[PDB]
């Protein structure tokens, strides 16, 4: 009843392959504050959905998405509800804006009872991925009540700078990804560690170059960094924040295991039908989608699917469906949400192009076949980053998808949000 997590025994969904269009996307970007004007880019988006609530974030800057002057950073929370016509909508209820919008980077949100806790990086040198050596590690926490109050002190909004971070042997750590999970009173955020390339142990014999003629054995190791001679390598994982502790907040870094290892990239961890799932973006030579059931969270190990149908666009070195080790840092973030564990079928958006960020398709797929899909825009639509999150409305599976697009109507690079019901039958 109402809007709930994807748990229990949902209504049935079509598990057969069909080339008919049976998915019917909707625009729901309206009850949100993305109010358009040209000259601006709206970048660094974030979407999270948990227990009938949501977190959202973006950075609006004037001019270039890269070099433009930052104007406003939004971190908002609200409810996911039925308008009355059995279609889920998003209603912002509590919005936080920092005083300096150029300093917040790489936010990540996880929900726990009364709040969304969103963990961000504070930087005075731009993106720490690009200014890794210049970035002094500074992490902040913005905690937002999903249902604010009137005379509640700092119950509504609470900003707090983290001083105690256990990073192990990594020089610094950072949130990297849109959303994470709770386990009891312990929160886990998708994150990344910066390791000096000098103390990175990696047997080059592990690099899988069998029947990969033009691939050398070093390529794996060299691809663990933003480029072949980067000072750091990036190792994905989790940042753990245990709410039961009390005292000065401690975050603790948990590196991801080295099976199907690829360069640290924006990832996300979420619960589906009882159990945690991990998606890691393929920013490297391993361009087939990286997702799977979490075996253990701490230490973090992931049973990656052997998916042979979903990939991501790249560039001339590591384009779509590339599978041989190369030295590259290319690709996009396009996550997927487990909606049926028995058949392991997932829902998500991919970019139907080999070397260009365009043509976003919402697809329901299994490991070796796409069951069904629908384009979300036109053939040539510039689109890059997609965040898909599914849930239940009156026990029917719905997915909300954030897609970062070029909007032609206002000539603005911006996020748009789509709601897709997953149909019961395979035939109209």
């Amino acid at each position, epitope marked *: 009843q109402g809007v709930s997590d994807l748990v229990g025994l949902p209504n049935q969904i079509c598990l057969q392959k069909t080339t008919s269009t049976i998915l019917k996307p909707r625009l729901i970007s309206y009850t949100l504050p993305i109010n358009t004007r040209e*000259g601006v880019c709206i970048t660094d988006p974030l979407l999270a959905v948990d227990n009938g609530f949501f977190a959202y974030s973006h950075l609006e800057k004037i001019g*270039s998405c890269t070099r433009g002057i930052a104007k406003q950073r939004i971190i908002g929370v609200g409810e996911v509800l039925d308008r009355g016509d059995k279609v889920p909508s998003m209603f912002m209820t509590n919005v936080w804006t920092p005083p300096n919008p150029s300093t917040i980077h790489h936010c990540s949100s996880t929900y726990h009872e009364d709040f969304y806790y969103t963990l961000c990086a504070v930087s005075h040198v731009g993106d720490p991925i690009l200014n890794s050596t210049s970035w002094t590690e500074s992490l902040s926490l913005i905690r937002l009540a999903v249902r604010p109050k009137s005379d509640s002190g700092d119950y509504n909004q609470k900003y707090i700078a983290i001083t105690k971070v256990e990073r192990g042997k990594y020089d610094k750590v950072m949130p990297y990804g849109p959303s994470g999970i709770k386990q009891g009173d312990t929160l886990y955020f998708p994150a990344v560690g910066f390791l000096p390339r000098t103390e990175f142990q990696y047997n080059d014999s592990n690099c899988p170059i069998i029947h990969c003629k033009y691939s050398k054995a070093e390529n794996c190791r060299l691809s663990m960094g933003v480029n072949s001679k980067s000072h750091y390598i990036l190792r994905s994982g989790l940042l753990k924040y245990n709410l039961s502790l009390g005292g000065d907040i401690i975050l603790q870094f948990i590196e991801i295991a080295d099976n199907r290892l690829t360069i640290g*990239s924006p990832s996300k961890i979420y619960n589906s039908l009882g159990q945690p799932v991990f998606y890691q973006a393929s920013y490297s030579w391993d361009t087939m989608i990286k997702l799977g059931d979490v075996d253990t969270v701490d230490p973090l190990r992931v049973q990656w699917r052997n998916n042979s149908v979903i990939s991501r666009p*790249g*560039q001339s070195q590591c384009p779509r469906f590339n599978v041989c080790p190369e030295v590259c840092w*290319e690709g996009t973030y396009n996550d997927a949400f487990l909606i049926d564990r028995l058949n392991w079928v997932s829902a998500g958006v991919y970019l139907n192009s080999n070397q260009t*960020a365009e043509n976003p398709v919402f697809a329901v797929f299994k490991d070796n076949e796409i069951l069904y899909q629908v384009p979300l825009a036109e053939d040539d639509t510039n689109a890059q980053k997609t965040i898909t999150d599914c849930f239940l409305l009156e026990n029917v599976i719905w997915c909300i998808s954030l897609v*970062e697009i070029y909007d032609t109507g206002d000539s603005v*690079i911006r996020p748009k949000l789509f709601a897709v019901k997953i149909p019961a039958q395979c035939s109209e």
Partner: antibody, heavy 132, light 108 residues
Framework: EVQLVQSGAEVKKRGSSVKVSCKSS????????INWVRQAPGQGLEWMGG????????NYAQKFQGRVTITTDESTSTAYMELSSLRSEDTAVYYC?????????????????????????WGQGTTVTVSS | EIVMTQSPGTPSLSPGERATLSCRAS???????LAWYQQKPGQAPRLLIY???SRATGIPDRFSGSGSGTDFTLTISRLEPEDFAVYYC????????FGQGTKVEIKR
């Protein structure tokens, strides 16, 4: 109505450098792109590069990467193209032209792509001779 | 990086007549990213076509664009004294490139 005005014809030594001006008469550079095209005497046109001032981005063809700096001055509504280490092969006429330019999303974690469109407003051209 | 080849190089044909000049890319390209320019004797070029079929601000209706994929075509309906000039095709976008040019001579 707007048209562009370029600097005067120049003669320069082999190894020297040139900085050709191109100023907007009617209005600012507001959101358009300024491309730089060159024509060797008796030959065809080759795109050297372009700039989009409202974004603060310049892009160049590979053949001229490193040798060419396309700069602006929005106080003076004026773009500049500087070529360096002039070889006899750079004796040519250099036009500045104006068309639309758009920033686009790229399949890269940080990079953006920049698209230079058809050029509809042309400067008169600036002849550059290089000879010892 | 994309290479444009034009043809013919030096066509000779008579005034008042129709003309068709071909441009071909070493790559398949979207039609949106193609232009036709005209350079009259000893002066600046001017834009005829963009998006492979559209005449610009202030252009006579003689000029017509065609083609897609890898093959493109400019068409002059009624040739006229000023219509004898050099014609360049341009693929534009990330790294624009011109063809070597087609110069329409006078037939006599």
């Amino acid at each position: 109505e707007v048209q562009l005005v370029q600097s005067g014809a120049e003669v320069k030594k082999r190894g020297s450098s040139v900085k050709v001006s191109c100023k907007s008469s009617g209005g600012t550079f507001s959101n358009y792109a300024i491309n730089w095209v060159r024509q060797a005497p008796g030959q065809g046109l080759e795109w050297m590069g372009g700039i989009i001032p409202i974004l603060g981005i310049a892009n160049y063809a590979q053949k001229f990467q490193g040798r060419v700096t396309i700069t602006t001055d929005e106080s003076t509504s004026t773009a500049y193209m500087e070529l360096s280490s002039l070889r006899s092969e750079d004796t040519a006429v250099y036009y500045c032209a104006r068309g639309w330019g758009r920033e686009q999303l790229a399949p890269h974690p940080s990079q953006y792509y920049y698209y230079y469109y058809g050029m509809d407003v042309w400067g008169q051209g600036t002849t550059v001779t290089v000879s010892s | 990086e994309i290479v444009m080849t034009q043809s013919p190089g030096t066509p000779s044909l008579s005034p008042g007549e129709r003309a068709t000049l071909s441009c071909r890319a070493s790559q398949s390209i979207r039609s949106t990213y193609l232009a036709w320019y005209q350079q009259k004797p000893g002066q600046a070029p001017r834009l005829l076509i963009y998006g492979a079929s559209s005449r610009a601000t202030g252009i006579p209706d003689r000029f017509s664009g065609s083609g897609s994929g890898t093959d493109f075509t400019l068409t002059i309906s009624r040739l006229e004294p000023e219509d004898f000039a050099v014609y360049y095709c341009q693929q534009y976008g990330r790294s624009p490139s011109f063809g070597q040019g087609t110069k329409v001579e006078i037939k006599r």
